[PDB]
Design a protein around this ligand. Sequence first.
Ligand SMILES: [Zn+2]
Lengths: 80, 134, 55
Amino acid sequence: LVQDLLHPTAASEARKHKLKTLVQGPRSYFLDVKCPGCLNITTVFSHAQTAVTCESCSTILCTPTGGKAKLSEGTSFRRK
Amino acid sequence: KGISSSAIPYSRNAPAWFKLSSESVIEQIVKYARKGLTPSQIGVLLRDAHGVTQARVITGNKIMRILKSNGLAPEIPEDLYYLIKKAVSVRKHLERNRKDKDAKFRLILIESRIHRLARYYRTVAVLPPNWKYE
Amino acid sequence: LKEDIHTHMAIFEQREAQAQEDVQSSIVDEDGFTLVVGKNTKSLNSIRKKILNKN
RNA sequence: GUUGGUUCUAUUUCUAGGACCUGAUUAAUAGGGACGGUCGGGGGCAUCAGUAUUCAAUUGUCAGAGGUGAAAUUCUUGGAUUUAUUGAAGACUAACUACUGCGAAAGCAUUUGCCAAGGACGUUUUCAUUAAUCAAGAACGUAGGGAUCGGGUGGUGUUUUUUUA
Ligand SMILES: [Zn+2]
């Protein structure tokens, strides 16, 4: 509509595309997942692009998708 | 043609949730490369699993630099390698069924795209000149 | 046996809806760890046994 | 920033100094490359299907039947046209089909499988100007709005379901 072309509202900055902002940034985020076989922590990407396997209890943790990789149904995550 | 790119952040003292050291990263990188993983794949594997943001900002130097620094470097650049083996696969397919003029058109485009960065790489001399299509 | 299986279904659907609501309401851990859960799964015992069978 | 030899150590512990046996900005809403889930009447090969059309066979019934503006002409009692049951042949993919999709263009609609390719999107992956434009040559014949297709993100109601993926 008519926007301050400097520093705009955060409600519009989190709305527009990650390239088109005034300073570009990521939108993926890292997160700690508990593999439910043996309960120990590993980090994982969000758009994880490959099947991570927690080498301690090497089950599976997330299968990838076109965007955010979905996690495997018994996992528990902390966003960080 | 549109845009589809990652946008690496403004931060460069990354990332302050990184408990891990800066030597085990190089250890994991040389492990994956002597497992036989291309720079793109070793970068994405330790991005996801042993979560780095990027090794150029956790370690002080890019992964091609540390692969040369640990004596594990490629003999042709990664892009020329992947594009060469794509060219040999489409040539093998057209050799199998030689009626595919669409594959002929695509092979002409693939070889032109080979010649572009080939003469670029000759002008910068990473792989030496006299080099024309293996 | 009409009233018998009437009472049996009337307790079974009660504990079943209770179990499913307990599953996909909200599970945070002792620390912050939200549990991944299915869209239409039904039991913590179910996700426990399937994470056992994917050993 | 991979071998051999010298001397100094007290209650074999455990020790100190020589030689000799691969370089340095950022990572564009410039670019090409990898990867993930995809997407398309995009392409090639192989395969499957359809009912038409043509032809053949088996019948059944009887003076007409294609064709025409009329006519003419054509065939018909050696039964045609029509009817029923099959079989063969190659061609083609109707209705679905749209101001929808894909391809550099011409063009591109049956199923399944294989072969590769391509787009867009996603990405805190990598390289670092690799770009642009045509001689020459090569292969092919003004802003705004409402929708809609492809991908992604988030929301939270219904269709959905539940320990097989
Ligand atoms: Zn475990």
